[PDB]
Design a binder for these strands. Structure first.
Ligand SMILES: [Mg+2]
Ligand SMILES: [Mg+2]
Ligand SMILES: [Mg+2]
Ligand SMILES: [Mg+2]
Ligand SMILES: [Mg+2]
Ligand SMILES: [Mg+2]
Ligand SMILES: [Mg+2]
Ligand SMILES: [Mg+2]
Ligand SMILES: [Mg+2]
Ligand SMILES: [Mg+2]
Ligand SMILES: [Mg+2]
Ligand SMILES: [Mg+2]
Ligand SMILES: [Mg+2]
Ligand SMILES: [Mg+2]
Ligand SMILES: [Mg+2]
Ligand SMILES: [Mg+2]
Ligand SMILES: [Mg+2]
Ligand SMILES: [Mg+2]
Ligand SMILES: [Mg+2]
Ligand SMILES: [Mg+2]
Ligand SMILES: [Mg+2]
Ligand SMILES: [Mg+2]
Ligand SMILES: [Mg+2]
Ligand SMILES: [Mg+2]
Lengths: 207, 257, 153
RNA sequence: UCUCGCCCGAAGCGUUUACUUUGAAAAAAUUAGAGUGUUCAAAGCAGGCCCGAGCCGCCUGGAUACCGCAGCUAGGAAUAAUGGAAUAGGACCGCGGUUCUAUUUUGUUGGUUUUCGGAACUGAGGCCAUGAUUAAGAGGGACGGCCGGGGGCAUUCGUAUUG
RNA sequence: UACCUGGUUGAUCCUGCCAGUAGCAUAUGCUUGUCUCAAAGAUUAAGCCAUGCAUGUCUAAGUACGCACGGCCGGUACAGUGAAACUGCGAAUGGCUCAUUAAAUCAGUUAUGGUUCCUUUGGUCGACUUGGAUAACUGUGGUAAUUCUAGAGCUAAUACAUGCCGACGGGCGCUGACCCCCUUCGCGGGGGGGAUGCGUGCAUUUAUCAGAUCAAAACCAACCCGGGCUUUGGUGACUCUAGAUAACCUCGGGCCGAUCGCACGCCCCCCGUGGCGGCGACGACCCAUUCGAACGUCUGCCCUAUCAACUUUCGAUGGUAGUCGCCGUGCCUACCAUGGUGACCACGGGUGACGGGGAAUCAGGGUUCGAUUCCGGAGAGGGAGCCUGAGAAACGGCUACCACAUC
RNA sequence: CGGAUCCGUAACUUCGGGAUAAGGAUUGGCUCUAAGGGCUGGCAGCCGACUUAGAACUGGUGCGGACCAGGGGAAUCCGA
RNA sequence: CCUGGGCAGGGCGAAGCCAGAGGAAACUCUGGUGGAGGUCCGUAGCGGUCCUGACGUGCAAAUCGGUCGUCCGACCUGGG
């Protein structure tokens, strides 16, 4: 019964428009589904033209793209911080189009080891994690190729992303609509946007 | 109204179908096809009303499903199948190969053609695009979507199409000096050489054309069909070159009889 | 700077230029749209700083349809101004005209600085931006008097 | 302008409305109006010639005119308004310098530099017939010999009336 | 037919109105022979309806063991007609009426590059046949009846579902044991090959990279030849289309034929136990066209000032993000700014107001109607919500309220 | 009825009033969110104030929970 | 008459002043500030409307309990 219509509105001046329609079919309104952080649960919605819409009532998985290095892996959604449109949905933990998700930083560590060897995030222990870190021994000139990847390109992921990898959480921005396509797809906050949202979260925790 | 329309009135019918006011209430609504309702001509109008092959429409409905009348090579089962400009109509028993060219007054002038030209067909390119795996597609106003056409086809060109295989050949471009035929507006059926195009940034460009014995007119790009190459039409057009002389010259021709 | 929550239309920021450590310039990743139509893009959209979603030279707002002209009346509405279009209406009975005008609101792009009240502005049709805004400011033509003059303080 | 093939296409193209002349512009019916002996006519979109039935037939119409007002295009420059150059921050041509980049030849790639193409800024000089239509039997203002029971304030005089 | 006449006065002239004059379309009175057309419960009551109808549908081509008719008819399912059902399509059309509605609806003109789209038209379509369920049908019933239905048995498929083979693996990305050449005593540097393992195609949802107008050299290091070489299209405009890069592709799961009919021939082989199958019906992921729908731009509408300020806590105007929606949107939400309209008549009322193309009225100019056969809108007593469906807030669909109203 | 907050308030008039007019909604507990400042260095950092508004959850509709505390309206006569 | 003492808190929001908007002018509209008054609800104080309540050989030869009018003043009150 929700009408997104525009015939119940005032004019340029503010004169009340007289009603004569009966809230027709081509001006539907469906209720909002606040996408929680629980398990995966998606219902269906019939759309005019026979189309199908995927309403995500609650989600656990996500697909988030790393910015600079162009990598994208699976992600468990952890926590909802700083909606920046309505602060009630931060406490409600509702996934919207422009929101911030804490990526569990585990599925990027395997790619960073596999392409950007001598990795980080080992809290300067240098004795743990028998990973196969030093087993394949890097026989041929692809060792030299990884040396070009590691020291000539120099792999600078400067200290903001260093501290986020040490904490194990990665601040990311959603880029898709969770209530429309049923997907919490997004990208990783990088650089100036990263420090801007970090400053906003720090000031919100401060005041 | 709710959904699409379903009937058509004789009064709301277009003028170029030569329909009556006393014969019936409803007009034959053409089915969906390659041509819009204002620029098409149904088979029941082509048979019952124009050529006078059957008096009633039920006989036309019987013969079009008794598989006599075919359009562009294949048989159409619909009595109200749309057939617009430049469509080859042949029925299988005698020499009857009709071309749906436009009369000078705007009607559908009949034109019986020899089989060696009835095998072929011209058609105007509507647009050109690229599709899956980087292949070129061409959309025709005859609702022909063909792949791998050619690289040197402008959007407003005219390409000869084969009816037996669906193969394109003999593209002619929109150039100053090509014989065109106007297919819409107030000057439809006008045959003339393209003289001067004038472009405009408002997504619609105008074209002044000239024809023989010193006459010139103007039209728009949505109503231009290139038919020839320098006073050499690829399709023979009936009743002279298809020229509107003057109403007074028409009266003088009727007095000369 | 910015006084909102996020301003980044299309251009990806981080090239990760740091191979030995340098700051450099950051005004190079800027989106630059040509509107066509034979109308010159101003240099404020070239060496500017603003980020606008509804800008005809920065945002995805396409210019189509009609092109009209008016005179600017007010500035008090945020990032969009109200213009006035005086015209005459022919009347068949009395066989002469009368003045009519319809005030329209139009999205003033922030690249068009020095947009003082009284200047003849060119507007173009676009998609519906808001409830009463449909046009978009395209080119400011007239200086609306002598800008050469200067008063005390 | 000769940037793309001694002239032209082409692009810079319009200071912009008001007004006119074209041209597209729309959907029919209706209105004026073409043809037609529906027995004339209101209508209708029909019908007409040859053939003793035997030409397994031919020919033609079903147009045009209006469609204001609003919108689009191409010509017209009289009529009515609008800014150009007044504290010159103007107009052309020719000069000095700073920063930057798209792509081509040095056989190719990688690093450096210039001419070139242009945007951005800046200094001097030459050049214009260098730039302001004169002041309406329009108006505002100024000067000065007046003029008026014009207005305000203060003063002065005159009988008469009453006591 | 560019038209008047009588009436104030004892009489005359003038302003002035009244009354005659003539169409038009409603009613009514009197009268009426032929014939061609011909509007016709609009005005008050968009008030109430008894009764009868107005939406059904089968091809050689979806499913036929009906107990119905019967081909010659023997048997290795099915000759054919085939009532009734299951399935798909349409019932969102047509007809009726003008009650609401005064920049609202409509009319002229422009675009969706800001969306969807039944059907048709073309492209794309790269396990010798599986599983339950059920109607019609047979017997058994209930009530006062309805287009009411239960429980027992049965069977079907293009209703539902599940799911296999082909097809060589082409080519590419990342790791990749090992191998060749040149130099150095080895260490070391450069160039060139090479199986396993993860991926792979179109769409969905992300993020990134490369993507056209412009020609002449000079220094330093590596390598090919005999001083010398390399590329999608369109718009006036793209965040358009098209490529490459890493992953999801969502159990309410995009596609990649477990379908039917006609004509019946051909080839190899040890047998056909294998192929060669020509044409037609179904939508099937997507792309365009077509029937449209939808919100958009400008301009245009009757009277009233005894309607001069209106709108804004229950968005009024704009911005920032988000939600919903088919998408562009104060359509909705949180924050921020205080806006927006009006004497060029907004706002507030009435219309015996659906808007036009049109109709009547004979100089020109105008005036008054247009419910009415065409187009577009609105509603099916008032008014709200919704399944199905591509398309409805549908009413010869449903659900609940009010006023009626049948057994 | 009574306090407080948010709406909305007539006849009449000396235009001041009438008015706390009339008539409605909320009021508890517990978590939060936003806003309202000072002091140092040439925008960054340390320290406290009880106020307002909004949201969720919950208790047997219970919330001025005791106490504190205007029933109201239409009129007539007289005295301002 | 002289000389001293005292009157808790809230409501209404006058003059004056500031800012914004309109108008050619006269001036008008809106949002604040301000705290005026023989002003309102109300305590102490001062009087005593009603229950014609209690008492009524009483606490009292005039008192008590509620309900009361007014409480910045034409206010209450000590001493000379
Ligand atoms: Mg805190
Ligand atoms: Mg209908
Ligand atoms: Mg009369
Ligand atoms: Mg709100
Ligand atoms: Mg009405
Ligand atoms: Mg007339
Ligand atoms: Mg007239
Ligand atoms: Mg509409
Ligand atoms: Mg309806
Ligand atoms: Mg009724
Ligand atoms: Mg119906
Ligand atoms: Mg009263
Ligand atoms: Mg009172
Ligand atoms: Mg009295
Ligand atoms: Mg008294
Ligand atoms: Mg008092
Ligand atoms: Mg009182
Ligand atoms: Mg009192
Ligand atoms: Mg007492
Ligand atoms: Mg007593
Ligand atoms: Mg006693
Ligand atoms: Mg008291
Ligand atoms: Mg009291
Ligand atoms: Mg008092």
């Amino acid at each position: 019964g929700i009408s997104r219509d525009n015939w119940h509105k005032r004019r340029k001046t503010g004169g009340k428009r007289k009603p004569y329609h009966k809230k027709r079919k081509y001006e539907l309104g469906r209720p909002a589904a606040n996408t929680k952080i629980g398990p995966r649960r998606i219902h269906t919605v019939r759309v005019r033209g026979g189309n199908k819409k995927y309403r995500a009532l609650r989600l656990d998985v996500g697909n988030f793209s790393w910015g600079s290095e162009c990598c994208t892996r699976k992600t468990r959604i952890i926590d909802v911080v700083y909606n920046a449109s309505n602060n009630e949905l931060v406490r409600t933990k509702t996934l919207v189009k422009n929101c911030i998700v804490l990526i569990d930083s585990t599925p990027y560590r395997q790619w960073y080891e596999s392409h950007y060897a001598l990795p980080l995030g080992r809290k300067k222990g240098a004795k743990l994690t028998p990973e196969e870190e030093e087993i394949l021994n890097k026989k041929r000139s692809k060792k030299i190729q990884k040396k070009y990847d590691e020291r000539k390109k120099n792999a600078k992921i400067s200290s903001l992303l260093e501290e986020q990898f040490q904490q194990g959480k990665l601040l990311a921005c959603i880029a898709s609509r969770p209530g429309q396509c049923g997907r919490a797809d997004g990208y990783v906050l990088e650089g100036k946007e990263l420090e801007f949202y970090l400053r906003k979260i720090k000031a919100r925790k401060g005041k | 109204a709710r959904g699409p329309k379903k009937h058509l009135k004789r009064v709301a019918a277009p003028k170029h179908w030569m329909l009556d006011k006393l014969t019936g209430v409803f007009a034959p609504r053409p089915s969906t096809g390659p041509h819009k309702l204002r620029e098409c001509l149904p088979l029941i109008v082509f048979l019952r009303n124009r050529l006078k092959y059957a008096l009633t429409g039920d006989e036309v409905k019987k013969i079009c499903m008794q598989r006599f009348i075919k359009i562009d090579g294949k048989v159409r089962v619909d009595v109200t199948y749309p057939a617009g400009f430049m469509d080859v109509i042949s029925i299988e028993k005698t020499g009857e190969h009709f071309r749906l060219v436009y009369d000078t007054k705007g009607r559908f002038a009949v034109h019986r053609i020899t089989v060696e030209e009835a095998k072929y067909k011209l058609c105007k390119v509507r647009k050109i695009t690229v599709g899956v795996k980087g292949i070129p597609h061409l959309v025709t106003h005859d609702a022909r979507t063909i792949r791998y056409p050619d690289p040197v086809i402008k959007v407003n060109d005219t390409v000869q199409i084969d009816l037996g295989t669906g193969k394109i050949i003999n593209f002619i471009k929109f150039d100053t000096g090509n014989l065109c035929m106007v297919i819409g507006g107030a000057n439809l059926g006008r045959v003339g050489v393209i003289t001067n195009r004038e472009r405009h940034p408002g997504s619609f460009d105008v074209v002044h054309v000239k024809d023989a014995n010193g006459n010139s007119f103007a039209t728009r790009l949505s109503n231009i069909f290139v038919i020839g190459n320098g006073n050499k039409p690829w399709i023979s057009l009936p009743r002279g070159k298809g020229i509107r002389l003057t109403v007074a010259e028409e009266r003088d021709k009727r007095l000369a009889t | 700077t910015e006084r909102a929550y996020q301003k980044q239309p299309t251009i990806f920021q981080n090239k990760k230029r740091v191979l030995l450590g340098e700051t450099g310039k950051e005004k190079l990743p800027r989106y630059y749209k040509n509107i066509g139509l034979g109308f010159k893009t101003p240099k404020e959209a070239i060496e500017g700083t603003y980020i606008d979603k509804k800008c005809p030279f920065t945002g995805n707002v396409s210019i189509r349809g009609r092109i009209l002209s008016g005179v600017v009346t007010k500035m008090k509405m945020q990032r969009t101004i109200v213009i006035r279009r005086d015209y005459l209406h022919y009347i068949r009975k009395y066989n002469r005209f009368e003045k009519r005008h319809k005030n329209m609101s139009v999205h003033l792009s922030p690249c068009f600085r020095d947009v003082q009240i009284g200047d003849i502005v060119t507007v173009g049709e676009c998609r519906p931006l808001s409830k009463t805004v449909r046009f978009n400011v395209l080119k400011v033509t007239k200086a609306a008097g002598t800008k050469k003059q200067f008063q005390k303080f």
